[PDB]
Design an enzyme around this catalytic site. Structure first.
Site, short mmCIF file in Angstrom:
data_model
loop_
_atom_site.label_atom_id
_atom_site.label_comp_id
_atom_site.label_asym_id
_atom_site.label_seq_id
_atom_site.Cartn_x
_atom_site.Cartn_y
_atom_site.Cartn_z
N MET A 1 40.22 -69.70 -31.65
CA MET A 1 40.83 -68.40 -31.39
C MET A 1 41.81 -68.07 -32.52
O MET A 1 42.76 -68.82 -32.81
CB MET A 1 41.54 -68.39 -30.06
N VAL B 1 48.14 -92.03 -45.27
CA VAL B 1 49.40 -92.25 -45.98
C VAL B 1 50.42 -92.84 -45.03
O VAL B 1 50.62 -92.27 -43.94
CB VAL B 1 49.93 -90.96 -46.63
N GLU C 1 45.57 -67.47 -22.39
CA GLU C 1 44.13 -67.66 -22.50
C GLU C 1 43.45 -67.73 -21.13
O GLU C 1 43.93 -68.47 -20.28
CB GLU C 1 43.85 -68.96 -23.27
N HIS D 1 49.40 -77.02 -29.30
CA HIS D 1 49.98 -76.23 -30.40
C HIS D 1 51.35 -76.76 -30.79
O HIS D 1 52.37 -76.11 -30.57
CB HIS D 1 50.15 -74.79 -29.95
N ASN E 1 48.05 -68.16 -30.20
CA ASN E 1 47.34 -69.31 -30.77
C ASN E 1 47.75 -69.44 -32.23
O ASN E 1 47.69 -68.42 -32.94
CB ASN E 1 45.84 -69.07 -30.57
N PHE F 1 46.86 -71.03 -35.36
CA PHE F 1 46.32 -71.39 -36.68
C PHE F 1 46.29 -70.24 -37.66
O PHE F 1 46.41 -70.49 -38.88
CB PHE F 1 44.99 -72.16 -36.65
C1 FAD Z 1 42.32 -78.73 -27.74
C2 FAD Z 1 42.96 -77.81 -28.79
C3 FAD Z 1 42.71 -76.46 -28.73
C4 FAD Z 1 43.26 -75.56 -29.66
N1 FAD Z 1 42.83 -74.26 -29.66
C5 FAD Z 1 43.38 -73.42 -30.65
C6 FAD Z 1 42.80 -72.16 -30.86
O1 FAD Z 1 41.74 -71.74 -30.30
N2 FAD Z 1 43.42 -71.38 -31.81
C7 FAD Z 1 44.58 -71.77 -32.45
O2 FAD Z 1 45.15 -70.90 -33.19
N3 FAD Z 1 45.03 -73.04 -32.38
C8 FAD Z 1 44.41 -73.82 -31.51
N4 FAD Z 1 44.81 -75.16 -31.47
C9 FAD Z 1 45.90 -75.55 -32.38
C10 FAD Z 1 45.47 -75.73 -33.84
O3 FAD Z 1 44.26 -76.51 -33.87
C11 FAD Z 1 46.61 -76.36 -34.62
O4 FAD Z 1 47.72 -75.50 -34.48
C12 FAD Z 1 46.29 -76.52 -36.10
O5 FAD Z 1 45.10 -77.31 -36.25
C13 FAD Z 1 47.44 -77.15 -36.84
O6 FAD Z 1 47.14 -77.16 -38.25
P1 FAD Z 1 47.94 -78.11 -39.23
O7 FAD Z 1 47.48 -77.80 -40.59
O8 FAD Z 1 49.41 -78.07 -38.91
O9 FAD Z 1 47.49 -79.59 -38.79
P2 FAD Z 1 46.14 -80.27 -38.24
O10 FAD Z 1 45.05 -79.26 -38.12
O11 FAD Z 1 46.53 -81.05 -37.02
O12 FAD Z 1 45.70 -81.25 -39.40
C14 FAD Z 1 46.43 -82.40 -39.82
C15 FAD Z 1 45.41 -83.33 -40.49
O13 FAD Z 1 46.19 -84.36 -41.16
C16 FAD Z 1 45.61 -85.62 -40.88
N5 FAD Z 1 46.65 -86.63 -41.01
C17 FAD Z 1 47.76 -86.76 -40.21
N6 FAD Z 1 48.59 -87.68 -40.64
C18 FAD Z 1 48.01 -88.19 -41.78
C19 FAD Z 1 48.40 -89.19 -42.69
N7 FAD Z 1 49.56 -89.86 -42.55
N8 FAD Z 1 47.58 -89.49 -43.68
C20 FAD Z 1 46.41 -88.79 -43.80
N9 FAD Z 1 45.95 -87.83 -43.01
C21 FAD Z 1 46.81 -87.55 -41.99
C22 FAD Z 1 45.01 -85.46 -39.50
O14 FAD Z 1 44.09 -86.50 -39.17
C23 FAD Z 1 44.45 -84.05 -39.53
O15 FAD Z 1 43.11 -84.01 -39.96
C24 FAD Z 1 44.17 -76.06 -30.62
C25 FAD Z 1 44.35 -77.42 -30.70
C26 FAD Z 1 43.76 -78.32 -29.79
C27 FAD Z 1 44.06 -79.80 -29.92
#
Ligand code: FAD
Ligand code: MN
Ligand code: MN
Ligand code: MN
Length: 498
Positions: free
Chosen positions: A114, A242, A353, A439, A477, A479
């Site tokens: 979303m 890391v 939602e 989130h 939401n 992202f």
């Molecule tokens: C069930 C669920 C449903 C959701 N539905 C929605 C939706 O429909 N729409 C929406 O807007 N948001 C949704 N979200 C939230 C959204 O997915 C997150 O807000 C978003 O992915 C966060 O992005 P980010 O870049 O902060 O981190 P993330 O996407 O969490 O990515 C972090 C990455 O870093 C990696 N990582 C972590 N620590 C390390 C390390 N030390 N070394 C190497 N790699 C590492 C992880 O493995 C991961 O791949 C949902 C989340 C979940 C769990």
């Protein structure tokens, strides 16, 4: 070895950063602790569905779990599993469980797709130091296009059995004077229509989402990361976590990086150095790295705001029991399409939602994931004994979020003569799930732990890119906000610093 730029993680902040770095000609290495999800498994599919969970469903757990809300119907399919580098990690803190993706693409692998812009007036409230005009004029549009956001066809939605559940809640909400809105998505809705017609392999219409979608969903591996790799200047190393970050004596940063296999066995410990270091490890992961670095003395000039300001985007789950004459259907698309927008920036705000349920038989339950405005925040506090940041959040801190969600859904119950379900979250009577988070937002807040572009305070060429930057709440939401902020930040950092 040395590489000019390192990006930790491969979620939204990371993926945006690496694309723009590669387009600027900066050789960039992304380090992702999870897998590249591209190997057909034992059922021939990359990802397990929600009715056939296996070790692919879970990051190093010994038993599968039902999707929240569905234990009463889906515990029957749960099984013991070998701990494995699976796709969804339930990270348990003392009074909060945060769910995150693990793999190339991060949470984009497991989320509901979303794609929602925050309300401008709320953006301006939460981030007053940021120029909101460039966000809405330039960066939100850029994110929208790159993410491949699309819109459901209204006539298909209205007619299909796969969205009856959404239509039922729309009608119920309407009797309380409450309106709904369509939710844009990165799942291809054209593809979804073809799934319903039997023309293409099903994914959303075959009870897949939270352990990945084998088709249809344009996760970041297909969008930003594919483009980053296409620059010729970006590479991704997987099963590389890391552990520590230090400033080298001669400038730049050195990382200790553990390489594991998919069983979690340690294969190698590597030292990787760089000129420019970008953290995209998520709210949890980036914050933990920096709290660890401060409190173990490897980045001693980090400030006291590192760790602070975390909130769960006001996430609360609840459910209503429909009248017998309002069944929600046995066949529910796994991708939500409708929400209830009751968000006016007041403390009563809710944006909820209308969530599908995967049971695949009639239960009469309507499920909702509410986003609320709750000022409470937590702090990640380093525990040197176990080498973990620990989130100090207590369940009572979600009382304002529960109260807001309950006030809204009480209006719907009153208008319709319905009651809540009380049995979806455990045996104890509990209508509002108040100790989970999909989130996570904050821990390295923009303009507090960092400057207004994510440059970490106290350091040069050290950047945070991801959900850790956001001050606990975005009202939608998250992202799209993470993506657009990352576009803003990396453009400015490349111009001024690189
Ligand atoms: C069930 C669920 C449903 C959701 N539905 C929605 C939706 O429909 N729409 C929406 O807007 N948001 C949704 N979200 C939230 C959204 O997915 C997150 O807000 C978003 O992915 C966060 O992005 P980010 O870049 O902060 O981190 P993330 O996407 O969490 O990515 C972090 C990455 O870093 C990696 N990582 C972590 N620590 C390390 C390390 N030390 N070394 C190497 N790699 C590492 C992880 O493995 C991961 O791949 C949902 C989340 C979940 C769990
Ligand atoms: Mn559009
Ligand atoms: Mn298939
Ligand atoms: Mn009624």
């Amino acid at each position: 070895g040395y590489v000019p730029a390192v990006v930790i993680g491969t979620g939204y902040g990371a993926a945006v950063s690496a694309l723009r770095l590669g387009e600027a000609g900066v050789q960039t290495l992304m380090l992702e602790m999870g897998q590249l999800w591209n190997q057909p498994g034992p059922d021939g599919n990359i990802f397990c569905g929600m009715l056939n969970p296996d070790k692919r469903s879970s990051w190093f757990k010994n038993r599968t779990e039902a999707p929240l809300g569905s234990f009463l119907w889906l515990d029957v399919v749960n099984r013991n599993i070998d701990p494995y580098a699976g796709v969804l990690d339930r990270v348990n803190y003392d009074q909060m469980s945060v769910y995150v993706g693990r793999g190339v693409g991060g949470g984009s692998l497991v989320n509901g797709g979303m794609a929602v812009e925050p309300k401008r007036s709320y953006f301006e409230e939460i981030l007053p130091r940021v120029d909101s005009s460039e966000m809405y004029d330039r960066y939100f549009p850029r994110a929208n296009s790159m993410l491949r956001v699309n819109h459901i066809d209204t006539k298909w939605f209205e007619d299909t059995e796969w969205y009856k559940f959404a239509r039922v809640s729309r009608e119920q909400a309407g009797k309380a004077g409450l309106g709904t809105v369509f939710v844009p998505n990165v799942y291809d809705f054209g593809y979804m229509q073809r799934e319903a017609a039997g023309e293409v392999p099903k994914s959303a219409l075959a009870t897949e989402v939270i352990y990945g979608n084998n088709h249809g969903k344009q996760s970041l591996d297909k969008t930003y990361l594919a483009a980053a790799l296409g620059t010729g200047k970006v590479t991704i190393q997987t099963l590389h976590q890391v552990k520590t970050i230090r400033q080298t004596k001669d400038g730049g940063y050195a990382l200790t990086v553990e390489q594991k296999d998919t069983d979690g066995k340690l294969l190698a410990t590597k030292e990787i150095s760089c000129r420019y270091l970008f953290l995209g490890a998520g709210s949890l992961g980036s914050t933990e790295l920096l709290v660890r670095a401060r409190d173990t003395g490897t980045l001693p000039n980090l400030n006291s705001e590192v760790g602070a300001g975390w909130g769960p985007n006001g996430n609360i789950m609840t459910a209503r029991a429909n009248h017998m004459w309002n069944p929600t259907g046995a066949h529910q698309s796994s991708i939500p399409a409708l929400g209830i927008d009751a968000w006016d920036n007041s403390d009563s705000s809710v944006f909820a939602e209308i969530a599908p349920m995967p049971a695949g038989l009639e239960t009469w339950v309507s499920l909702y994931l509410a986003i609320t405005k709750n000022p409470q925040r937590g702090t990640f506090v380093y525990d040197a004994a176990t080498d973990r940041a620990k989130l100090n959040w207590t369940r009572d801190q979600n009382a304002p979020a529960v109260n807001a969600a309950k006030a809204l859904f009480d209006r719907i119950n009153k208008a319709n003569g319905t009651i809540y379900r009380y049995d979806l979250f455990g045996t104890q009577l509990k209508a509002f799930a108040d100790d989970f988070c999909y989130h996570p937002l904050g821990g390295c807040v923009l303009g507090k732990a960092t400057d207004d572009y994510g440059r970490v305070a106290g350091y040069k060429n050290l950047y945070v890119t991801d959900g850790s930057l956001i001050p606990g709440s975005v009202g939608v939401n998250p992202f799209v906000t993470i993506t657009a902020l990352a576009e803003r930040n990396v453009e400015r950092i490349i111009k001024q610093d690189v």
